[PDB]
């Protein structure tokens, strides 16, 4: 069973040193926290929380890195790799990646804003990468409610809480324009915009993304609060806000009628997001983790030991 006292005895201090590994970060990019966190997931809902993602190329298995989900998407690995060793430093061969990442998330929570908690630990990292099962896995934009679902079920999460609970990631960070452009200008084969989409909303994004214009510009994710992790996102939705397609499921699937009252619960209370994203948060963080004397204590969170 994973515990969150796992290191108060062998590195007391893991929590402390990730913390400032991303306070410094910050400050030269305020987007590293929202980064960390999605490489905790994209980690998560691919094999568990086994810190598979981290793994570079080698001649037997392709990393990751190059899913659709991934590719020149992903980012902050320098910054684990700093936090690692840092850790190894305070304590080494104790901190696996897996838990690394999983602190290295929930930091980044709490500094961005959100709340703050003690996540489970004793995962241990894999002994491989999973490329396929990650383009399998990881749930796309363009995904509809039905597959959104039906992507965490495949993981372990059958809440449509946690669903809607973990969206509220994109309480902050970023997102290319090259996922919301058949949004602006041509959704479904239609020839016209999703209508789920705010009018007024749809024309400050037709602004940063015109067509034809650079797919790669960045967007916040949202519009209120684009660096703050809050509650926010939710407000955005009802408003028919949300930026890519698979937020404004939540509230405009015809298929919602589960999610929609969520979704206004997570908008009309902090305390309750709050307490829901917790609770989604360790549910992902127990996705087939690794423990014991399984998988082993990766030195350097990019390849196998030795
Ligand atoms: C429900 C399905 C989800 C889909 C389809 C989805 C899709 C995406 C997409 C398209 C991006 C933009 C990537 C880019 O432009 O390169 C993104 C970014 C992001 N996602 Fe999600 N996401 C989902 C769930 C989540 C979850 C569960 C979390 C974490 C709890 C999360 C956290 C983030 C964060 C923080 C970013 C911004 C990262 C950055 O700015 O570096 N996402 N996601
Ligand atoms: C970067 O932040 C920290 C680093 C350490 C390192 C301890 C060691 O190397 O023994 C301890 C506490 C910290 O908050
Ligand atoms: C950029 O982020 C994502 C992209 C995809 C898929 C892209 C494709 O099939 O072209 C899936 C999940 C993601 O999180
Ligand atoms: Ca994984
Ligand atoms: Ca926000």
Redo the contacts with the bound molecule.
Sequence with gaps: QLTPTFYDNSCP?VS??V???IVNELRSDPRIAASILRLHFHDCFVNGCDASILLDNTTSFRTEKDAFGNANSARGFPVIDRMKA?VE???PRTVSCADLLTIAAQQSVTLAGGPSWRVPLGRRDSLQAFLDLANANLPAPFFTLPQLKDSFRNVGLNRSSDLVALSGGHSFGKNQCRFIMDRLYNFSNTGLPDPTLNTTYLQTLRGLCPLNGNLSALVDFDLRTPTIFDNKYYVNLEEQKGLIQSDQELFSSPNATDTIPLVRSFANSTQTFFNAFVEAMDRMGNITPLTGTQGQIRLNCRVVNS
């Design positions: 201090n402390n040193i913390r400032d590994t840092a430093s305070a304590c």
